[PDB]
Design a protein around this ligand. Structure first.
Ligand SMILES: CCOc1cc(C2CCN(C)CC2)ccc1Nc1ncc2c(n1)N(Cc1cc(C)cs1)[C@H](CC)C(=O)N2C
Length: 124
């Protein structure tokens, strides 16, 4: 079908804090995943029109990507680190839901998820 609008990334009416955890999530976790060889499918929303996948947004009702997560962190959209961790987990899980066990794109998300969990292990 049409793509939906991307997820909201900025709400100037949401109260804002800096934490060590939110700082680590942007400066370490997002940055490390971004630069990974396997990041590029996850750096922007799924453009299902360009990809010719009419069923993508029939299956995926909670879309998420690292581009949105980067903007959410930069815009202090998250109050609790867990909100950001949940967006990363939504992104990975969306990939496992839409795709099939052993698919190249699933193995890519699995490796990103493993790196995620290694970085989250050291959340301050
Ligand atoms: C046909 C071209 O497709 C893409 C182009 C770009 C460009 C990368 C560089 N930037 C600057 C522009 C977009 C980024 C991503 C894609 N494709 C893409 N994005 C997300 C997903 C995706 N495909 N695919 C398809 C596949 C990918 C691979 C490696 C195997 S199968 C699946 C299904 C939607 C997926 O889950 N994701 C997140």
């Amino acid at each position: 079908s049409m793509n939906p609008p991307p997820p909201e990334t900025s709400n100037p009416n949401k109260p804002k804090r800096q934490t060590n955890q939110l700082q680590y999530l942007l400066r370490v976790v997002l940055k490390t995943l971004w630069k990974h060889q396997f990041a590029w499918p996850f750096q922007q929303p799924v453009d299902a029109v360009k990809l010719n996948l009419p069923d993508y947004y029939k299956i995926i009702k909670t879309p998420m990507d690292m581009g949105t997560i980067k903007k959410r962190l930069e815009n202090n959209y998250y109050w609790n680190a867990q909100e950001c961790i949940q967006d990363f987990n939504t992104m990975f899980t969306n990939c496992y839901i839409y795709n099939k066990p052993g698919d190249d794109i699933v193995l890519m998300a699995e490796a990103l998820e493993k790196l995620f969990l290694q970085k989250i292990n050291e959340l301050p």
